[PDB]
mmCIF file of N, CA and C and ligand atoms in Angstrom:
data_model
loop_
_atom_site.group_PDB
_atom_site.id
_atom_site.type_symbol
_atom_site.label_atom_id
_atom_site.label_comp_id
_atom_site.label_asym_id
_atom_site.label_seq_id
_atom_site.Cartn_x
_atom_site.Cartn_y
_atom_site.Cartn_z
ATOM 1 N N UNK A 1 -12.665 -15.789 9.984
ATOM 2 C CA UNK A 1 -13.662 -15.748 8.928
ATOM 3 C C UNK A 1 -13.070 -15.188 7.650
ATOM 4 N N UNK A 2 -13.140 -13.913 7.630
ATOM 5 C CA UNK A 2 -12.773 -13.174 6.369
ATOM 6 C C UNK A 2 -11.140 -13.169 6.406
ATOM 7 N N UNK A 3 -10.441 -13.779 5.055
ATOM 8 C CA UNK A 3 -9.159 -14.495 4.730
ATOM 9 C C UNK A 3 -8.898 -12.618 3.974
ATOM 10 N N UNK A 4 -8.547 -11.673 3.952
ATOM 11 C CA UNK A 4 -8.213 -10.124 3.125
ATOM 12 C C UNK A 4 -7.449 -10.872 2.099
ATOM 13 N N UNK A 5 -7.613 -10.569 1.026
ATOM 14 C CA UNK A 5 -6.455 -10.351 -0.150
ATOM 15 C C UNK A 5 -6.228 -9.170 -0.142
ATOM 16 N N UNK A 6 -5.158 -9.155 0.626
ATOM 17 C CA UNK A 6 -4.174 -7.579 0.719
ATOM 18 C C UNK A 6 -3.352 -7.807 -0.270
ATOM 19 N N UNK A 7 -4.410 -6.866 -1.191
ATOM 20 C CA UNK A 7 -3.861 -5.777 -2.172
ATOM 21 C C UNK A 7 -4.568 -4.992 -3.016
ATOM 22 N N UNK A 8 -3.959 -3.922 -2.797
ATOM 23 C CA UNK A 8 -4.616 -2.426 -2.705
ATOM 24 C C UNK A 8 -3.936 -1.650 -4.077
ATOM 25 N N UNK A 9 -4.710 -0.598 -4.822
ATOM 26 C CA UNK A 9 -3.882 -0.120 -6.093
ATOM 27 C C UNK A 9 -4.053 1.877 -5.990
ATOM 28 N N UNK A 10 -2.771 1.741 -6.838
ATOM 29 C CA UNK A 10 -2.902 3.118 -6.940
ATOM 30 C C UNK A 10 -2.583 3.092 -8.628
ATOM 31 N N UNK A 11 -2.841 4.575 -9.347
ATOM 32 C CA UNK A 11 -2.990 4.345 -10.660
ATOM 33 C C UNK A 11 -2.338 5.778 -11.047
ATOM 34 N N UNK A 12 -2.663 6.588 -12.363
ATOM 35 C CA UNK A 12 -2.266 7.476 -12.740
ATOM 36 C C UNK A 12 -2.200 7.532 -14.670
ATOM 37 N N UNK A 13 -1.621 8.839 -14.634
ATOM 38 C CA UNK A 13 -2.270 9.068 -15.745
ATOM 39 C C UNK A 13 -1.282 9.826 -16.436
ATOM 40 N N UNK A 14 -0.999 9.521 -18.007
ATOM 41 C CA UNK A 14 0.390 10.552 -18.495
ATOM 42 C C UNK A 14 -0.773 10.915 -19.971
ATOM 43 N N UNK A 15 -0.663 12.434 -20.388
ATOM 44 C CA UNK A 15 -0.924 13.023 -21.470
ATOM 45 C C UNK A 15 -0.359 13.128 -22.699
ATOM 46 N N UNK A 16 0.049 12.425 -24.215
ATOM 47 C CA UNK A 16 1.069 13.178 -24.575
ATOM 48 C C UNK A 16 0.374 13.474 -25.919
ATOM 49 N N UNK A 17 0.172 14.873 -25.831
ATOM 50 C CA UNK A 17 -0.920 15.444 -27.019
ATOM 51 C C UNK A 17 -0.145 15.937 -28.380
ATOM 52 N N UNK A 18 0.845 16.630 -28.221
ATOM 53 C CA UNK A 18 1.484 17.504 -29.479
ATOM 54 C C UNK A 18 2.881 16.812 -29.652
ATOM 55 N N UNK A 19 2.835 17.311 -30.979
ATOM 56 C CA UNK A 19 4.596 16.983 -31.491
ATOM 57 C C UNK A 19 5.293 18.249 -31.647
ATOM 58 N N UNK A 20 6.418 17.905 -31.020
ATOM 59 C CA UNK A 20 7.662 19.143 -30.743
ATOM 60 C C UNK A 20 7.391 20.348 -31.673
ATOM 61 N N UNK A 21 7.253 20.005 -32.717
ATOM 62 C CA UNK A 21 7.547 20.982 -33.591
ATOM 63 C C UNK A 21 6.426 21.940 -34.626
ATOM 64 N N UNK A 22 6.220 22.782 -34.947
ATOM 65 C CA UNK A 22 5.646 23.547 -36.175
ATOM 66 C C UNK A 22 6.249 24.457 -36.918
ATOM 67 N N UNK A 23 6.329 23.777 -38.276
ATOM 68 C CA UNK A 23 7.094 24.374 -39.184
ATOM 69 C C UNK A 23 6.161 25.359 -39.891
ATOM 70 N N UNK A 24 6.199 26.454 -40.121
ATOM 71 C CA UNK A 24 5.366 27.206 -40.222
ATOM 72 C C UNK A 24 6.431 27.975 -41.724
ATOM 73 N N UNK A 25 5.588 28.051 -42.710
ATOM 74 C CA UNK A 25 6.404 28.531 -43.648
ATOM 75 C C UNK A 25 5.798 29.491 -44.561
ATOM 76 N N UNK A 26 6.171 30.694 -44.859
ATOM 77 C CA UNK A 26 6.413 31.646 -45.931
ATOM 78 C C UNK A 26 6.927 31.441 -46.880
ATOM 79 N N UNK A 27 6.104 30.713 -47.934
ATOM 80 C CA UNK A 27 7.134 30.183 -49.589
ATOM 81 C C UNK A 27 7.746 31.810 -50.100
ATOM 82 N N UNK A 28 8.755 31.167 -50.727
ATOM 83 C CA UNK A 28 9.318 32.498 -51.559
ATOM 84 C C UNK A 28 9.158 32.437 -53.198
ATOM 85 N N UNK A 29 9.066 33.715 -54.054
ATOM 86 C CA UNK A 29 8.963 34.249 -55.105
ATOM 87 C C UNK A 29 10.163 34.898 -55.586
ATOM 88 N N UNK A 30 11.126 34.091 -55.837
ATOM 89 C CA UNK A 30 12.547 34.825 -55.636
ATOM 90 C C UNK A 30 12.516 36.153 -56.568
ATOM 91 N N UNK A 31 12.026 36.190 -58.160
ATOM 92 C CA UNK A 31 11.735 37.129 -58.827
ATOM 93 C C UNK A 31 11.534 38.137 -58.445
ATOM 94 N N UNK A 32 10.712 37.934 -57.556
ATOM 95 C CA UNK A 32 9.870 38.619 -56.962
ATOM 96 C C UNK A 32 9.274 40.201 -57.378
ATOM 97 N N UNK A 33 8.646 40.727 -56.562
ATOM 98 C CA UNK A 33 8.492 42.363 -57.645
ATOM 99 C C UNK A 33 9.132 43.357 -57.508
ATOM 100 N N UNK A 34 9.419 44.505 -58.482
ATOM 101 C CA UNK A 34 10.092 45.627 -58.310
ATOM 102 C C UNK A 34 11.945 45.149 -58.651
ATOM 103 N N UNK A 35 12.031 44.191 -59.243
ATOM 104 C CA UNK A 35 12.840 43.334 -59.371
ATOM 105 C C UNK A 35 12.884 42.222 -60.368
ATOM 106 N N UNK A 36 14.079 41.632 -61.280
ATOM 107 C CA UNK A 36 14.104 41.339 -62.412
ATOM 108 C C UNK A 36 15.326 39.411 -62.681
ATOM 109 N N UNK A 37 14.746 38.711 -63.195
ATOM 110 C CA UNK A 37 15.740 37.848 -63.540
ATOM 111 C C UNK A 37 15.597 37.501 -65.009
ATOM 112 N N UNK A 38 16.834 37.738 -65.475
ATOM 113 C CA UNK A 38 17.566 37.040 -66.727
ATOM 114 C C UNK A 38 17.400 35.380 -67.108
ATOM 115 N N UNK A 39 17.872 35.434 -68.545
ATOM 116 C CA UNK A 39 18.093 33.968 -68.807
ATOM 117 C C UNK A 39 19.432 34.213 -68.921
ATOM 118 N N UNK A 40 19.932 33.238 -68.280
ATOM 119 C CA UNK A 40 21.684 33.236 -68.408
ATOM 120 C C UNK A 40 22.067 33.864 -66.730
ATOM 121 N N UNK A 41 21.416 34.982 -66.130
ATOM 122 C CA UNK A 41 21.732 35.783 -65.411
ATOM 123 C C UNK A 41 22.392 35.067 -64.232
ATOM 124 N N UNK A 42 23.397 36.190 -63.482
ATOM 125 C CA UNK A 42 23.942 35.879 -62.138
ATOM 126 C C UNK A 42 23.782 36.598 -60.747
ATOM 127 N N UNK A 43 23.607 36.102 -59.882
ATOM 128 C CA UNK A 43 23.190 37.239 -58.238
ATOM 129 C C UNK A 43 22.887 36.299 -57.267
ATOM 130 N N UNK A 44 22.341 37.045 -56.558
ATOM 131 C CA UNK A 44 21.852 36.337 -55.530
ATOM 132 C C UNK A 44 20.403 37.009 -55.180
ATOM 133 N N UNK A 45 19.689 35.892 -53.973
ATOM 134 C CA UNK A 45 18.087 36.355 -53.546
ATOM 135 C C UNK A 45 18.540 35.783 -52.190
ATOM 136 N N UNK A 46 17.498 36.615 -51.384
ATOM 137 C CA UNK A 46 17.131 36.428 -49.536
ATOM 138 C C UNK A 46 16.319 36.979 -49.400
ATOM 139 N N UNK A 47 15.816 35.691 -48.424
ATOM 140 C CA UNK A 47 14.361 35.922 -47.959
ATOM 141 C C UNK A 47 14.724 35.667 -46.569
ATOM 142 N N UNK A 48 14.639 36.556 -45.490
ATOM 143 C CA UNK A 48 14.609 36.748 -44.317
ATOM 144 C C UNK A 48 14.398 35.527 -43.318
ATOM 145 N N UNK A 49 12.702 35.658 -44.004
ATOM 146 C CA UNK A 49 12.112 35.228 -42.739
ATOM 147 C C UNK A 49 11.074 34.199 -43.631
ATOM 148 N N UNK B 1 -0.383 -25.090 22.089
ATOM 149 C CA UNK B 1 0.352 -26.576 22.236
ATOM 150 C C UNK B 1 0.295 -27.021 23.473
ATOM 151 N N UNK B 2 0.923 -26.406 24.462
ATOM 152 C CA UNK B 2 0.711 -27.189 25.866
ATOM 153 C C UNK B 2 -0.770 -25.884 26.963
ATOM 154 N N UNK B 3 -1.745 -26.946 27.059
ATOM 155 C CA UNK B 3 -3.092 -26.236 26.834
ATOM 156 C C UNK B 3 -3.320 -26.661 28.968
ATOM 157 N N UNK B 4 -2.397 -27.328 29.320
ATOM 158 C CA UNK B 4 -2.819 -27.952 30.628
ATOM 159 C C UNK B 4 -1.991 -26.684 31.697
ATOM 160 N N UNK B 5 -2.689 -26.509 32.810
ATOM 161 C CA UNK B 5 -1.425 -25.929 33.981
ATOM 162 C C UNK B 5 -2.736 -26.217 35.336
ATOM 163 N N UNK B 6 -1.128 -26.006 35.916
ATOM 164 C CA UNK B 6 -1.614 -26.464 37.515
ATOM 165 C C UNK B 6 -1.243 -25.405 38.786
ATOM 166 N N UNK B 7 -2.017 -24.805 38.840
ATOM 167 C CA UNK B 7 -1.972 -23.494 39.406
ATOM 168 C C UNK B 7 -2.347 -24.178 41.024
ATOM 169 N N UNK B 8 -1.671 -24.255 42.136
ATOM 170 C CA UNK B 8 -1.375 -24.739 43.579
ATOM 171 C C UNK B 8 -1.783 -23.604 44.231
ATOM 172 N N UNK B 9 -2.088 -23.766 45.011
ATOM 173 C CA UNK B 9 -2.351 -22.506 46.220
ATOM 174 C C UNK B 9 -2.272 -22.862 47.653
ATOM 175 N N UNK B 10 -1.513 -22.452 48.358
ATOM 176 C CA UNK B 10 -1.047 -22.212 49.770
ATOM 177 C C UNK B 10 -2.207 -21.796 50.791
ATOM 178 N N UNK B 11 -1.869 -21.540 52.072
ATOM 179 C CA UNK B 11 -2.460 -21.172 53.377
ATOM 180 C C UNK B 11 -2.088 -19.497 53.293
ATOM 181 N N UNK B 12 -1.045 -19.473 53.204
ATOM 182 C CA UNK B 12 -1.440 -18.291 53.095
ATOM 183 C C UNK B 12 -1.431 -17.135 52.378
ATOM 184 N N UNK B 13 -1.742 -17.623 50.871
ATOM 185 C CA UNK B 13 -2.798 -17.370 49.812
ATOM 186 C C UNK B 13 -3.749 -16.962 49.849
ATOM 187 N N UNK B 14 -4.206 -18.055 50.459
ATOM 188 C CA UNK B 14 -6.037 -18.214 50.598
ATOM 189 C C UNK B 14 -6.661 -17.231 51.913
ATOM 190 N N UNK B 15 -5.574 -16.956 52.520
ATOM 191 C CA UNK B 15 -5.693 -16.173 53.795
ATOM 192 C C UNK B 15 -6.187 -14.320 52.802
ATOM 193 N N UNK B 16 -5.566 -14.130 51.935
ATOM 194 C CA UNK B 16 -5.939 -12.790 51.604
ATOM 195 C C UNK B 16 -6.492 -12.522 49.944
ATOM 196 N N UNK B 17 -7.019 -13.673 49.788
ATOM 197 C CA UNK B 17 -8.267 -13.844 48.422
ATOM 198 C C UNK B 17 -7.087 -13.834 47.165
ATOM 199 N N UNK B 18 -7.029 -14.809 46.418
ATOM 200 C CA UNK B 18 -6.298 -15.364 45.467
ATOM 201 C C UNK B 18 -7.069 -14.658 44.313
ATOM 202 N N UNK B 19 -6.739 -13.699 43.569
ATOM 203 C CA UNK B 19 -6.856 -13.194 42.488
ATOM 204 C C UNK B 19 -6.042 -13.509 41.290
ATOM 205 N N UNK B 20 -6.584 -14.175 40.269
ATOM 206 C CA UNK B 20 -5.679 -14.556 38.573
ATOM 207 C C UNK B 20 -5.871 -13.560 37.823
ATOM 208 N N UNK B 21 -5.339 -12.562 37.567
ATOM 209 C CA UNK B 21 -5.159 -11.790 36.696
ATOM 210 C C UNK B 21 -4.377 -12.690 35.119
ATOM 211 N N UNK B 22 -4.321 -12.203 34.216
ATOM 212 C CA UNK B 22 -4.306 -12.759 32.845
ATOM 213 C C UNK B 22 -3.907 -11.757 31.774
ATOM 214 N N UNK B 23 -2.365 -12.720 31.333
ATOM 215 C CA UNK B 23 -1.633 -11.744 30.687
ATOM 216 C C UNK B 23 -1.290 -12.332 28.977
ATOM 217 N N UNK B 24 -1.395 -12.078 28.147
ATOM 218 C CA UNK B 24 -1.564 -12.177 27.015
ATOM 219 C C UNK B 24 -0.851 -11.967 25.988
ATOM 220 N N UNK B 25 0.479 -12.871 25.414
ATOM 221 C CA UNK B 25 0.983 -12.474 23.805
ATOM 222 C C UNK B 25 0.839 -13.137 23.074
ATOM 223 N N UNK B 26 0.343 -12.326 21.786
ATOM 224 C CA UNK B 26 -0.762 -12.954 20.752
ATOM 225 C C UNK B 26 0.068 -12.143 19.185
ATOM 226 N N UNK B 27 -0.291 -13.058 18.417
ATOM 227 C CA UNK B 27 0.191 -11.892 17.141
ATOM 228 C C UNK B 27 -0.947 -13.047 15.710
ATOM 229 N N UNK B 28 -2.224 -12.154 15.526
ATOM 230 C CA UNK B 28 -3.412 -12.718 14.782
ATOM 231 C C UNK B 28 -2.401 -13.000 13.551
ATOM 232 N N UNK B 29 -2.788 -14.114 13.025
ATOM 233 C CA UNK B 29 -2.404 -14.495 11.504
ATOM 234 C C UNK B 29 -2.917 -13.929 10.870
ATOM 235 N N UNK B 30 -1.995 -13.950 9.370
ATOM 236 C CA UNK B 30 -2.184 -12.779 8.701
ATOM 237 C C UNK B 30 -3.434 -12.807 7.891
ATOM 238 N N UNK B 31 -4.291 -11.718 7.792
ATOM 239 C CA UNK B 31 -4.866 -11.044 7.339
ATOM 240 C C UNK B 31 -6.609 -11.402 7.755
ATOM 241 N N UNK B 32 -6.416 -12.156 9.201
ATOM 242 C CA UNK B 32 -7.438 -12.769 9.599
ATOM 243 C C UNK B 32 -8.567 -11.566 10.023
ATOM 244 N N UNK B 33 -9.800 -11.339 9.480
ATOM 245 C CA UNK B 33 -10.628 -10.663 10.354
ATOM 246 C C UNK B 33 -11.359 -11.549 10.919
ATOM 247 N N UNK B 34 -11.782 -11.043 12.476
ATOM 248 C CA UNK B 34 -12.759 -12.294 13.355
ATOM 249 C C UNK B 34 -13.361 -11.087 13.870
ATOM 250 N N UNK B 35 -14.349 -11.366 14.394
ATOM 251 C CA UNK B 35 -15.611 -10.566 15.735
ATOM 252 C C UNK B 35 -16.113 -11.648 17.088
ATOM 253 N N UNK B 36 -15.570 -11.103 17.911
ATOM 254 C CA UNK B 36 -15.957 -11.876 18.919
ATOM 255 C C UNK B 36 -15.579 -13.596 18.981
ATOM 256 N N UNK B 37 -14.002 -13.464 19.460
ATOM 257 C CA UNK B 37 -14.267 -15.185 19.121
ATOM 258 C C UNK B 37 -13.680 -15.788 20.419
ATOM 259 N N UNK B 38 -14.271 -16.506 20.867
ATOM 260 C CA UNK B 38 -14.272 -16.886 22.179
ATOM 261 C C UNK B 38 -13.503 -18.057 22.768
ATOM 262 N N UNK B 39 -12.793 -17.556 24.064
ATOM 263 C CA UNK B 39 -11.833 -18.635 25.069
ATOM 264 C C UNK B 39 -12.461 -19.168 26.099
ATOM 265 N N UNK B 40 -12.262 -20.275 25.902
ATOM 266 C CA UNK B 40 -13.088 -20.870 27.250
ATOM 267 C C UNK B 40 -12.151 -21.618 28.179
ATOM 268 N N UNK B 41 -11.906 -21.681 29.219
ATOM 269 C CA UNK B 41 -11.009 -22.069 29.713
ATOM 270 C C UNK B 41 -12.042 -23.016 31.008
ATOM 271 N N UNK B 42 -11.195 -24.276 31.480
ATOM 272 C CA UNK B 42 -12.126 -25.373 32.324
ATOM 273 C C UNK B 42 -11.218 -25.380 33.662
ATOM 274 N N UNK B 43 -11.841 -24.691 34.755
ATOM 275 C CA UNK B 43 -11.386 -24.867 36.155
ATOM 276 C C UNK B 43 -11.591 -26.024 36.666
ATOM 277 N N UNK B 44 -10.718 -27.116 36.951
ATOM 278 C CA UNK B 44 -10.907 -28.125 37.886
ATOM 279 C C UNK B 44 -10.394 -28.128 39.272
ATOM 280 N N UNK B 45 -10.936 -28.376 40.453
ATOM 281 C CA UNK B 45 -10.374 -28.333 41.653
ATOM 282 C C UNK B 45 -10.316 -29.689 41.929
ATOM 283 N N UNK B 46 -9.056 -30.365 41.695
ATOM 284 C CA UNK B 46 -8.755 -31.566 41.652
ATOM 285 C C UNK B 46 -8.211 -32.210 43.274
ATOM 286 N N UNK B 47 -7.561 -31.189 43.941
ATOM 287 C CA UNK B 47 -7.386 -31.793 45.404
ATOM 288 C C UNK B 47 -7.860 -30.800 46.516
ATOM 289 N N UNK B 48 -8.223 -30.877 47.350
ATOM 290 C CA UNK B 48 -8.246 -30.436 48.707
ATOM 291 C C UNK B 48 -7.898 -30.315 49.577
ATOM 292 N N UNK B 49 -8.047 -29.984 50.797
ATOM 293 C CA UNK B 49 -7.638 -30.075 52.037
ATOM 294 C C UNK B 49 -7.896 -28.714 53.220
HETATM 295 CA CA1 CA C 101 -9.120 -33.959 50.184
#
């Protein structure tokens, strides 16, 4: 009577929510305060972080 | 395919009750479901004595 179409499934499931990276940034004020730049002037500035 | 047999019986056979037991290799095609499906088989006692 009954002819089966054998075939049977299995399934599943992949997430892919975020991108690698976050750049997360603190702009700088090189002038900055308590502290002085020239016209003409020479030095250097660092900002850590 | 060959559906005929000729099963003979002796004197002394018949002397201690002739029992046919029935032995069976089968392999159902594939993916067949059946319920109850029936063999009929036709005893003829064709000679005597
Ligand atoms: Ca006869």
């Amino acid at each position: 009577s009954v002819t089966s179409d054998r075939t049977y499934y299995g399934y599943g499931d992949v997430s892919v929510k975020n991108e690698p990276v976050n750049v997360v940034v603190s702009p700088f004020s090189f002038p900055g305060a308590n502290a002085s730049l020239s016209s003409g002037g020479q030095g250097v500035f660092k900002k850590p972080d | 395919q060959h559906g005929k047999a000729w099963i003979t019986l002796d004197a002394e056979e018949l002397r201690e009750g002739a029992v046919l037991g029935a032995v069976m290799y089968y392999e159902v095609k594939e993916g067949v479901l059946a319920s109850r499906l029936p063999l009929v088989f036709k005893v003829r006692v064709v000679e005597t004595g």
